[PDB]
Amino acid sequence: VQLVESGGSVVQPGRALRLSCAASGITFSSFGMYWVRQAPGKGLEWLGYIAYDGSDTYYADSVKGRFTISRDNSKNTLYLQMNSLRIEDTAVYYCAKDYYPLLSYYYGLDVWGQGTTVTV
Amino acid sequence: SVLTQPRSVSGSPGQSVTISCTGTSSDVGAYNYVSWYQQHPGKAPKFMIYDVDQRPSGVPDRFSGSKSGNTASLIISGLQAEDEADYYCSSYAGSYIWVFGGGTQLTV
Amino acid sequence: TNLCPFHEVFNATRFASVYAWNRTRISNCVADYSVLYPFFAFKCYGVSPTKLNDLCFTNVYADSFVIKGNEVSQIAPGQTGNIADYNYKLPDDFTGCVIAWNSNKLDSKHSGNYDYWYRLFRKSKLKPFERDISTEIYQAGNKPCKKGPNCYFPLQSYGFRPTYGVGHQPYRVVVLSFELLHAPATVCGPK
Ligand SMILES: *[C@@H]1O[C@H](CO)[C@@H](O)[C@H](O)[C@H]1NC(C)=O
Ligand SMILES: *[C@@H]1O[C@H](CO)[C@@H](O)[C@H](O)[C@H]1NC(C)=O
Secondary structure, three states: OOEEEEOOOEOOOOOOEEEEEEEOOOOHHHOOEEEEEEOOOOOEEEEEEEOOOOOOEEEOHHHOOOOEEEEEOOOOEEEEEEOOOOOOOOEEEEEEEEOOOOEOOOOOEEEEOOOEEEEO | OOOEOOOEEOOOOOOOEEEEEEOOOOOOOOOOOEEEEEEOOOOOOEEEEEOOOEOOOOOOOOEEEEEEOOEEEEEEOOOOOOOOOEEEEEEEEEOOEEEEOOOEEEOO | OOEOOOHHHHOOOOOOEHHHOEEEEEOOEEOOOOOOOOOOEEEEEOOOOOOOOOOOEOEEEEEEEEEEHHHHHHOOOOOOOOOOOOOOOOOOOOOEEEEEEEOOOOOOOOOOEOOOEEEOOEOOOOOOOOOOOOOOOEEOOOOOOOOOOOEEOOEEEOOEOOOOOHHHOEEEEEEEEEEOOOOOOOEEOOO
């Protein structure tokens, strides 16, 4: 199950940007997905999580009310809708697969994508 | 509420080192859910230790860890030359929020 | 002059796994709570533990199971975690008491006690006092799990051992849930 990341670009501050990753195979619908951000020269930051059924979605306080996480169960793709990007929002964005299927959460992130580069 | 780590940890091949990360009584102490990730330059993080001491298939037995109070640590024994990587811990902060630590660079 | 059989759940030779906890219905009792009062934890919600004998109820349920010491904090209202959501859920308006004690001398076999299981993941989060004792293997892909790639087993074991630290060694917990119904109180202390 490879995670193929795309949607990165160089954008002007204040504008919106759509990020996504495609999950190979048919197991996408069985797992919850996470977003993680890593700014250059810095460590990792948790961005949010969406449940396998699309019901429960959580965000890190830093981006709460700004970023929206959603998924398309038929296309097997994960989306991140970014709004009002700021000067500081320059980083590589990763999506990741929950170690366990269905609702699990308290384990960790097993499968990571290569990372989408977003700059301002 | 970011977990504090050593910027860099020294060591040499054949020896053991420890990488600690500290939180507060509200996260690292309250929940035994500390997960450690191993990242190489130009590569996505690898899933290493989960639930404080447990490891997913594919992780060498030389990688372990422990927890005491509000401090969690990664224990690496028998350091090899390719163990040179940036390590991160992730704790459960409650209310369905996770926190990654600052990150530690391991040297050999 | 008819004492209540609380000892039957507290003095049990074996406790059920947390994924499949036991429930005992207690009624028709002169319920002295002195019998059940060194314990690890003794904390009550909505009911006074000092003179609990004086306030009586219609029915009380005793939920019994075994967990590890560092998971005891999840057996409380308002809490979340691997147990709180997938194994044993309490209501946010609990009126009762959670009693726990160390069982390292009973359950922690030196060979490894693998008779106690817990759930790793779930279809949906549990409702208060909901139990799920299904141990079917989950198929994430489109291939039979006859356990192999994309196959996951919901339950994992507590590898209890006498050489483990306190937070990783077994505790036996009994939750006493008191309730009032349309019926007159039936479980009341001595008088
Ligand atoms: C088991 O029964 C004995 C009766 O002598 C009592 O002293 C003991 O406290 C009981 N154990 C528990 C956990 O209630
Ligand atoms: C306790 O739980 C076990 C496991 O499901 C079951 O076999 C046993 O019959 C239960 N006993 C009671 C009194 O519920």
